[PDB]
Amino acid sequence: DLLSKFDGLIAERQKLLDSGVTDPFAIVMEQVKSPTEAVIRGKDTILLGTYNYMGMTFDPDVIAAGKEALEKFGSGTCGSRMLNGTFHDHMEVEQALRDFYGTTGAIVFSTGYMANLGIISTLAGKGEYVILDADSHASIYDGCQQGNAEIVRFRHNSVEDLDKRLGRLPKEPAKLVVLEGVYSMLGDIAPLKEMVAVAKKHGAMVLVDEAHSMGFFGPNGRGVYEAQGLEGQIDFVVGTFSKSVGTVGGFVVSNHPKFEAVRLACRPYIFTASLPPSVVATATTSIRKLMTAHEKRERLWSNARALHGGLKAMGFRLGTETCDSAIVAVMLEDQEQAAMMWQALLDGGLYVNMARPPATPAGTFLLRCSICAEHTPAQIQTVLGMFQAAGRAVGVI
């Protein structure tokens, strides 16, 4: 039947579980005390595998805004943004994004996945081009699949291939170059300055995703593009509420005069309910605090540098030479080594994000650590000691 196609995946899963490893796709956070602490399988555990970069999910102002919105506006809107679903707090969250990015336009979607799906498929039509990194987020590829444009993949992280591929396209048709500021798999940074220069040389519009940089890159926390001096040069910035902001939702911001007309045509905007009042209320409060959360930014980067430096010095192969983001990826030689490390860490009281094929390319096996502004120095050292113990026991170092 229709599910027979999953027999291989089912057998692969059972093979993994035959090794005695905890099912990595069924972890449950039974309790979550803070941004950095949970209870998993009854064990107190340090969280080092979340995108709660700025610790906003337990910020007292954020929590209070959510509770107040539940009380005042109820649990949901029961309507789309095109009909009855735009409440006070939806207007507030779009304004918060305008203020955060310094843009005249802001369109909020129910998820980041849907923002990418919708904006890519709506902006570029038949006879037009979407140009993207080969290893772009699934939602960006799904946006391409949803639309009718010509898709132009370029070699991962290659300014040269972007330039050459763009240069061979016909000059007249409109073009969208889609870039990510931070590459989430290894936690390295895109050469946006150089790539945007190339895009503009070829007359393309540019969309940059700043999901993994929000609140901690650039003077205003706007992202890698801001840090690299590209303010005013980026046509569209896409992002999410599910990482630094600490809830769910997606968005696109722009200064283009016709931008908010996208609402009239964008299927993933139109054909879904708007977000719950409490979600857009917590997002508004969080976004506004993220404009100036300097103490948190400082702690986040201090923690990232300490973890990155410590793991590198201990003998782990890292995805990056220098600490360039809040993701630190440990690279292992094979799937077994990654699973054994991950299990030892878990059993010892530490959660990190394992990544193996097909999540990663064949031959790449990772423990992806992500830092929080609210990790303490003691926690980061506890983590390093845990990696030392696990690495020695498993034979990685």
Added chain:
Amino acid sequence: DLLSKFDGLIAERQKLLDSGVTDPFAIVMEQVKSPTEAVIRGKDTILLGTYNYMGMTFDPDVIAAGKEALEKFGSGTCGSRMLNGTFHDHMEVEQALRDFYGTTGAIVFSTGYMANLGIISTLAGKGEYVILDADSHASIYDGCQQGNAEIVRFRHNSVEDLDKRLGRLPKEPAKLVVLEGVYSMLGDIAPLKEMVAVAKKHGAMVLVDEAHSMGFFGPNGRGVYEAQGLEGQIDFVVGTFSKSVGTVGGFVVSNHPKFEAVRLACRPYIFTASLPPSVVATATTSIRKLMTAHEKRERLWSNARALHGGLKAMGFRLGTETCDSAIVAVMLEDQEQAAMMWQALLDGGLYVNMARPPATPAGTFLLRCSICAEHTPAQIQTVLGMFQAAGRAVGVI
């Protein structure tokens, strides 16, 4: 540039606004007192254009569950369901759905749109078939577009065309027939008993969307399929948290033994954050109350019958001869008549959902009313008096 394609839509919008009508796509609920009352443009307004069918968004148990989850688990998970994003309340909401539908399997997505997008594109692959009503929800079509299957549209509401089109397909390949229990545009009901019999005659699996029926059709509130005696015959049921349940989210339930393996392969499940703790907590509480909300069900149907009967008797052309759902669609002769009615109702203190092309087919112009369990008899009569006044002033009756 990329936005020049919207010049026509922008001109169309300005033409509409030149008539002096309030922008129907920019309505803001400044305050929302209850499921049935809001403040719009500073005016106290009865809401008669929401999908809050069972009034659950202000249920005190629902609200309390959301507040408690914010306090205990924070504003968001900052991770996917495949990694760090499955908290206690995510497991709770999936179990609530199992209990609600009497199924062994339940997979929750971040929106109903994404549940349809994902389940359709993941279940049916190359060489297989998705068979759907010509006027299916956008998300169902988008699921088809996202996948690699052969798409087979059948004439709207035609058991005969479903049968004939299915019969011409090759017998061996697996097939998914996708049906909706309630047709949302006019509020009529699908002939599921007959269509499912046809699907099974041709050996197809069946997916039914019960978004517009949840909690008020069938003995257990499971939907039109349950009301029509099809318990145990439906392979997959898809739904949403954004209507009766009163928050955001999507889901698919099934008794198929391999079903939850869908999680391993479904892109809109994998590549997005899980829902906020408060969202899955309010949904759990709401879903469980909806299993036995008999007083509300009774009120909802009483209100629907009173509104449907009243509008019909007053001389409005309705989308349905009998009151078959909680949607009552008033059909107007042209766009101007619909807009004038909608504006008169709005100015007089009533919000309904206008629908004009391209939301509707060319030549169809609607005021779509939707009933709530928490509308009072006085409110329903107030609404009827408002329709009488508006209809007389505009010249519709």
